[PDB]
Amino acid sequence: MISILHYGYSFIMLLGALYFYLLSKDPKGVPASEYLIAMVIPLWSGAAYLSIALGQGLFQYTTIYYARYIDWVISTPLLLAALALTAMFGGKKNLTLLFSLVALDVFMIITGFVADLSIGTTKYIWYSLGVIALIIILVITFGPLRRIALSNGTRLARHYTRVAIYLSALWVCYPTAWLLGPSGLGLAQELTEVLVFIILPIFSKVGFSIVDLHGLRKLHQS
Amino acid sequence: MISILHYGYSFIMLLGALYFYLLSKDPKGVPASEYLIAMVIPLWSGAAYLSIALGQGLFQYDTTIYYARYIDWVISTPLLLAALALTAMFGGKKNLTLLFSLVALDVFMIITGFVADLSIGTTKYIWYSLGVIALIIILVITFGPLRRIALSNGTRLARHYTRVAIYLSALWVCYPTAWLLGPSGLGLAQELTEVLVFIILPIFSKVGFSIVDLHGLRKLHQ
Amino acid sequence: MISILHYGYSFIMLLGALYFYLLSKDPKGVPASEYLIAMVIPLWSGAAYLSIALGQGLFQYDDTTIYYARYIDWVISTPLLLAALALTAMFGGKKNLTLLFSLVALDVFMIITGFVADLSIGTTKYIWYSLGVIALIIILVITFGPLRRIALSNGTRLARHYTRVAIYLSALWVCYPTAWLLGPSGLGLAQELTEVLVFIILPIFSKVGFSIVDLHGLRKLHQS
Ligand SMILES: CCCCCCCC/C=C/CCCCCCCC(=O)O
Ligand SMILES: CCCCCCCC/C=C/CCCCCCCC(=O)O
Ligand SMILES: CCCCCCCC/C=C/CCCCCCCC(=O)O
Ligand SMILES: CCCCCCCC/C=C\CCCCCCCC(=O)O
Ligand SMILES: CCCCCCCCCCCCCCCCCCCC
C-alpha cells in the first residue's frame, strides 16, 4: 500500500507542476521566478517520493524515510521564498529577510534528520532546536514579513495573510506528526504517519501555490 | 593505465584554468564572472579526477562506481549551462530565472544518473529516463527561448552562441549514450573504453568549450 | 573532558549570536545582511560542535578520531567569514560579488581538501593538504591585494578598519592548517587533547571575536 500511495503522490506532483507551467505561459503580472519556484517544489518532492515508491528512499535503524528530508531540505525553503516574494509583491525585495528564513528552514529539516537518527534525550535536543527554528520562522511570518506585505497595500496584504495562515497551519502539523509517530513517542501507527506525510504535502506542495498564484494573478488588471 | 589517464586529465584541467586566468587579466569586454565560471569548471573537474587517479573517487557495487564523476558533474555541468546562458545574454539584459531553470534541470539530471548507477533492473532505467527527459528540456530551452535571447543581442553574438550551443549539445548527448552502453547500463562497451570516453569528452567540454566561448566573445570587443 | 569543552563552546556561540542580534536592532549604518552573516557563523558552528559534545559528530578511522563535524562547520562558517571580510572592503561602495564568490569557491575547496586529507593516509593525505594550503595562499593574495585596493577606494577610515580585520582573520587562518598538521590528523606531534583545545579556542576568536571587532569598527564609521 505504501508503494502505491507514493506513486500516486508523484503523479499528483507532476500534474501540479504542469498546471503551474501552463499558468506561467499567460503570467498576468506574476514574475517568471515565482512560477519556477512553484514548479521546482512539486517536481523535487515528486522525485524524492518516487524513490520511496521504488523502495529506495528508506532504510532500517524502525524505518527511516530519509527521502522525506532530501525532499524538505529543498522544497520547504523554496515554499518560504515563495511566501516572502508574495509579501514583497509590488515593492522592493528584502533578500536578507528571505535568506534568514531559508537558513532557519534548512537548519530545521537537518535537526529533524539528525533527531530521527538519534535515540533518547539526544533525539529531543535536536527536535527542540528544530521547533525553536519553526517558532522564529512563524514570528518573522506574522511579524516583520507581514509588515512588508502591509507596506505593499491592503489587497496584497489580504492575500499574503491568507497564504501565510494556510502554510503556517500545515507547518505545525509536520513536527506534531513526527513527534507522535515512530520517529518520536511512537503513539501513532506507521501507516497513519505514512498517510499524513502523503496528504499534508499535497496541500503544501501543490495546494499552497494554487492559492498563492491565483491570488497574485487576481491582482492583475488586464 | 586508468590512474595515469586521470593524472594527465587533471594536468590539462590545471593548464586550461591558468590559460583562462591569463585571458581574464586582459578581459576585452568579457565580464569577470564569465572568466571565474571558465576557471572553476576545469579546476573542480581536475580535483575530482585527481581523487580517481589516487584511487579514492570510486568503490565496488559487482562493478566499479566512479562516484567522483558525479561530484564533478553536479558542479561543472550547471556552471557550463550558466556560461552558455550568459553568452546568449551578452550585451543585453540577463534572465537569471531562465539561467537557474537550466541549473535546476541539470543538477536533477546528474543526481538521476548517480541514483541510476546505484540502482538495478527497471529502477535503474526509470532514473536514467528521468535524466534523459531533463536533458531534452535543456536542449529545447537551449535551441528555443535561450537562442531567441541570443538573436535579440545581434547577428554576430547569435552566430557565436549557435556555434557554442551546437558544440556543447553534441558533447551533452554523448555522456548519456556512453553511460547506457557501458558497465553502468547495458554493459555492451568494455570498462576501459568508457574510462577513455569519460577522459576525452570532458577535455572538449571542460576546456574546449570555454576556449571557443571566450575567444568568440573577446572577438566581439573589436 | 572533550564533551564538556564542546558544550561550553556551543554556549559561547549562542551568547555571541544573541549579542550580534541585539547590535542588529540598532544597526548604525551597517546593512542587515552583515548582521545576518555575523549571526549564522556562530549559530552553525555551535550546532556542529554540539553534535561533537553529544558524541555524534566524530568517528574512528586509522585507529584515530575524525571530528568530521568540524568540516561540516567550516564548509559554511569560513566562506561566510570571507563574505563578511569582502563586504567590509566594499562598505560605502559598489559590490564586487565576482571577487566575493571567487573567495567562497577557494574557501569551500580548502575545507573539502582538509576533510579528504583527514580520510587519507601517507603521500595522498599531504597532496590534499597541499592543495588546501595553495587555496589559502590565493585567498591571502586576494585579501591583501585586489580586495584591499577596493577597501582603499572606500576611504582612509574604512581601509584602516579593513586592514585590521584582514590581519586578525589572516593570523587565525594560518593557525588552523598549522594545528591540523601538528595534531593527530597530520604528523601527530601534539596530543589529541592539545588539538581539541586549539580547535575550541581559535574558533571563539574567529567565530565571535572577528565579528565583534568587524561590527564595532563599521558601527564607529556611522555619523549620528
Ligand atoms: C544541505 C543542502 C541545503 C540546500 C539548500 C537549498 C535552498 C534553495 C533555496 C533557495 C531560495 C532562493 C530564492 C531567491 C529568489 C530570488 C528573488 C527574485 O526573484 O527577485
Ligand atoms: C549541488 C549543486 C549545486 C550547484 C552549484 C553550482 C553553481 C551554478 C550556478 C551559477 C549561477 C551563476 C550566475 C552568474 C550571474 C552573472 C550576472 C552578472 O555578471 O551580473
Ligand atoms: C558546501 C556548500 C557551501 C555553500 C556556502 C554557503 C555560504 C556562502 C556565502 C555567501 C554569502 C553571500 C553574500 C552576498 C552579499 C550581498 C550583500 C548585499 O548586496 O547586500
Ligand atoms: C546548509 C546551510 C546552512 C545555512 C546556510 C545559510 C546561508 C545563507 C545565510 C546568509 C547569507 C545572506 C546573504 C543574503 C543577503 C542579500 C542582500 C541583498 O542583496 O539584498
Ligand atoms: C487555513 C486552512 C489550513 C489548511 C488548508 C488546507 C486544508 C488542509 C487540511 C488538512 C488535511 C488533513 C491532514 C491530516 C490527515 C490525517 C489522515 C489520517 C488517516 C489515518
C194 and C64 in contact (C-beta within 8 Å)?
Answer: no
Interface check A166 vs C, CB under 8 A: no
SS3 annotation, C99-154: HHHHHHHHHHHHHHHHHHHHHCCCHHHHHHHHHHHHHHHHHHHHHHCHHHHHHHCC
B-chain residues within 8 Å CB-CB of C105? 36, 40
CB contact under 8 A, A47 and B101: no
3-state secondary structure of B64: strand
Cβ within 8 Å of residue A206, ≥6 positions away: A12, A13, A15, A16, A42
Neighbour tally for C153: CB within 10 Å: 14
| Other chains touching A, judged by 3 or more CB pairs under 8 Å | B, C
Q: Is C40 on the interface with A (CB under 8 A)?
A: yes
Q: Which long-range contacts (CB under 8 A, 24 or more apart) does C189-198 make?
A: C192/C65, C193/C1, C193/C2, C196/C2, C196/C5, C197/C5
The C-alpha torsion from A62 through A109 and A122 to C66, rounded to 10°, is 100
Q: Which ligand is nearest to the CA of B103?
A: 2
- Ligand lying nearest the CA atom of residue A76: 1
Round to whole Å and give the CA distance between C6 and A47. 38
Chain C nearest-CA distance from A96, in A, is 5
Q: Does C131 touch chain B (CB under 8 A)?
A: yes
With 0-12 CB in 10 A as exposed, 13-18 as middle and 19+ as buried, what is C128? buried
C36 closest CB neighbour out of A99, A107, A111: A99
Method: X-ray
Which ranges of chain C does DSSP label H, i.e. alpha helix? 2-25, 32-53, 69-89, 97-119, 123-144, 146-152, 156-182, 192-203, 210-220
Count CB-CB contacts under 10 A for residue B178.
Answer: 18
Residue A47 and residue B130: Cβ atoms within 8 Å? yes
| Cα separations in angstroms, A139 against A143, A145, B31, B47, B156 | 6, 9, 41, 44, 53
Question: Is A113 an interface residue toward C (CB < 8 Å)?
Answer: no
Q: Do C33 and A96 touch (CB under 8 A)?
A: yes
Judged on CB neighbours under 10 Å (0-12, 13-18, 19+), A117 is middle
Find out whether the beta carbon of C31 lies less than 6 Å from any atom of ligand 3.
yes
Cα C110 to middle of ligand 5, angstroms: 46
Atom index in ligand 2 nearest the CA of residue B78 equals 8
d(CA A124, nearest CA chain C) in Å: 12
Q: Is A221 on the interface with C (CB under 8 A)?
A: no
Q: Tell me if chain C has a CB within 8 Å of the CB of B40.
A: yes
Whether A172 is in the pocket of ligand 5, judged by its Cβ within 6 Å, is no
**Residue A118 to residues A105, A114, C177: CA-CA distances in angstroms?**
20, 6, 32
CA A193, CA A183: separation in Å to the nearest integer?
Answer: 10
Subunits close to B (at least 3 CB pairs below 8 A): A, C
Query: From the list B104, B123, B130, which residue is nearest A56 (CB)?
Result: B123
* CA-to-CA separations, C97 to A101, B36, B44, C90, C147, in angstroms, rounded: 22, 11, 20, 10, 11
The H or E element containing residue B108 is helix B96-118
Site to substitute for ligand 3 among C39, C43, C71, C104, most atoms within 8 A of C-beta: C104
